[PDB]
Design an enzyme around this catalytic site. Structure first.
Site, short mmCIF file in Angstrom:
data_model
loop_
_atom_site.label_atom_id
_atom_site.label_comp_id
_atom_site.label_asym_id
_atom_site.label_seq_id
_atom_site.Cartn_x
_atom_site.Cartn_y
_atom_site.Cartn_z
N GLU A 35 -9.90 2.97 12.98
CA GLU A 35 -9.74 3.48 11.63
C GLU A 35 -10.63 4.72 11.33
O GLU A 35 -10.23 5.63 10.62
CB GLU A 35 -10.02 2.39 10.61
CG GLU A 35 -9.01 1.30 10.61
CD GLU A 35 -7.71 1.65 9.95
OE1 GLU A 35 -7.55 2.78 9.45
OE2 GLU A 35 -6.79 0.82 9.98
N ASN A 46 -3.91 10.68 1.31
CA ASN A 46 -2.49 10.47 1.60
C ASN A 46 -1.69 11.21 0.53
O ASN A 46 -1.42 10.69 -0.57
CB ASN A 46 -2.13 8.96 1.63
CG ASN A 46 -2.97 8.18 2.64
OD1 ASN A 46 -3.00 8.54 3.84
ND2 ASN A 46 -3.73 7.18 2.17
N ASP A 49 1.47 9.57 -1.17
CA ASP A 49 1.41 8.58 -2.24
C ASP A 49 0.22 8.66 -3.18
O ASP A 49 0.04 7.81 -4.06
CB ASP A 49 1.58 7.16 -1.70
CG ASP A 49 0.33 6.60 -1.13
OD1 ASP A 49 -0.59 7.37 -0.82
OD2 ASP A 49 0.23 5.37 -1.07
N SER A 51 -2.86 8.17 -2.80
CA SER A 51 -3.95 7.24 -2.52
C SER A 51 -4.95 7.83 -1.53
O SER A 51 -4.67 8.84 -0.89
CB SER A 51 -3.40 5.91 -2.00
OG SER A 51 -2.95 6.02 -0.66
N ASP A 53 -7.95 6.57 1.57
CA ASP A 53 -8.56 5.52 2.41
C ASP A 53 -10.04 5.84 2.61
O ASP A 53 -10.41 6.96 2.90
CB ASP A 53 -7.88 5.47 3.77
CG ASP A 53 -6.42 5.21 3.68
OD1 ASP A 53 -6.02 4.32 2.94
OD2 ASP A 53 -5.67 5.86 4.40
N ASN A 60 -7.75 1.24 1.25
CA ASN A 60 -6.91 2.16 0.50
C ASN A 60 -7.10 1.94 -0.99
O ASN A 60 -7.25 0.81 -1.44
CB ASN A 60 -5.45 1.94 0.87
CG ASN A 60 -4.52 2.98 0.23
OD1 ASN A 60 -3.92 2.72 -0.81
ND2 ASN A 60 -4.45 4.17 0.82
#
Ligand SMILES: [Cl-]
Ligand SMILES: [Cl-]
Ligand SMILES: [Cl-]
Length: 130
Positions: A35, A46, A49, A51, A53, A60
């Site tokens: 990750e 992102n 969308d 969002s 992380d 998220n």
């Protein structure tokens, strides 16, 4: 901070991750490596969308933490997403335990399916004293 492998492994063991909801320490190690490369300050926006992380597990903002700036978001970990950018990972661990209480478990992270699931992850903990 960027953890070294074995120091991370002992850090997560202290924080009660080994076998948490059936999840070996090595799986958590594999998840963290893929990750973020063990980097607590890691972020990924992102655009698709809106969002973001956050942190060493890349949790998220839509579902788990609040950053104020993600539409229609809920904060199931009851934390500011900033709590997931700390050197000290206790808050990130608590949130990760919360993610895996939901019905997918670790499967919620696609990087785990790709890079960890049904693989030999023993190497992640080798030599670490855990
Ligand atoms: Cl396993
Ligand atoms: Cl917070
Ligand atoms: Cl800190």
């Amino acid at each position: 901070k960027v953890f070294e492998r074995c120091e991370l492994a002992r850090t997560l063991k202290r924080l009660g991750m080994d076998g948490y909801r059936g999840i070996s320490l090595a799986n958590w190690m594999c998840l963290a490596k893929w990750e973020s490369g063990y980097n607590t300050r890691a972020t990924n926006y992102n655009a698709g969308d809106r969002s973001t992380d956050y942190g060493i597990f890349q949790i998220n903002s839509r579902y788990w933490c609040n950053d104020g700036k993600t539409p229609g978001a809920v904060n199931a970990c009851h934390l500011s997403c900033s709590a997931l950018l700390q050197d000290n990972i206790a808050d990130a661990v608590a949130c990760a335990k919360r993610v895996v209480r939901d019905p997918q478990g670790i499967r919620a992270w696609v990087a785990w399916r790709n890079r960890c699931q049904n693989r030999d992850v023993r190497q992640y903990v080798q030599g670490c004293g855990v």
